[PDB]
Design a protein around this ligand. Structure first.
Ligand SMILES: [Ca+2]
Ligand SMILES: [Ca+2]
Length: 109
């Protein structure tokens, strides 16, 4: 459901930059899409979407399908690509990326 909030071309540039099988980075991808500077409000709303299960948290499984809201079958993480997002979005090593953690990494991307 984040397709209406964004763009379009912004999703075609980030995915075209990481479509490879292991070329995803979390900083270059989100940096191109535009979430880096969207508005903390519409950002907490972007995360609310990343939370595919409704646990106010981004779990590793969501990280794999993190691009489903932008494309139902858009990017499909390769596993190693998921080990990058998790090791780049989790610092406390809790296995869960809350908002401040998510809106902090997405904005600093
Ligand atoms: Ca979750
Ligand atoms: Ca965390």
């Amino acid at each position: 459901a984040a397709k209406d909030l964004l763009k379009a071309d912004d999703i075609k540039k980030a995915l075209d930059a990481v479509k490879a099988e292991g070329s995803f980075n979390h900083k270059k991808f989100f940096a191109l899409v535009g979430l880096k500077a969207m508005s903390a409000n519409d950002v907490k709303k972007v995360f609310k979407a990343i939370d595919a299960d409704a646990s106010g948290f981004i779990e590793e499984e969501e990280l794999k399908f993190v691009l489903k809201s932008f494309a139902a079958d858009g990017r499909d993480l390769t596993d190693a690509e998921t080990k990058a997002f998790l090791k780049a979005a989790d610092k406390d090593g809790d296995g869960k990326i809350g908002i401040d953690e998510f809106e902090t990494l997405v904005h600093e991307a």
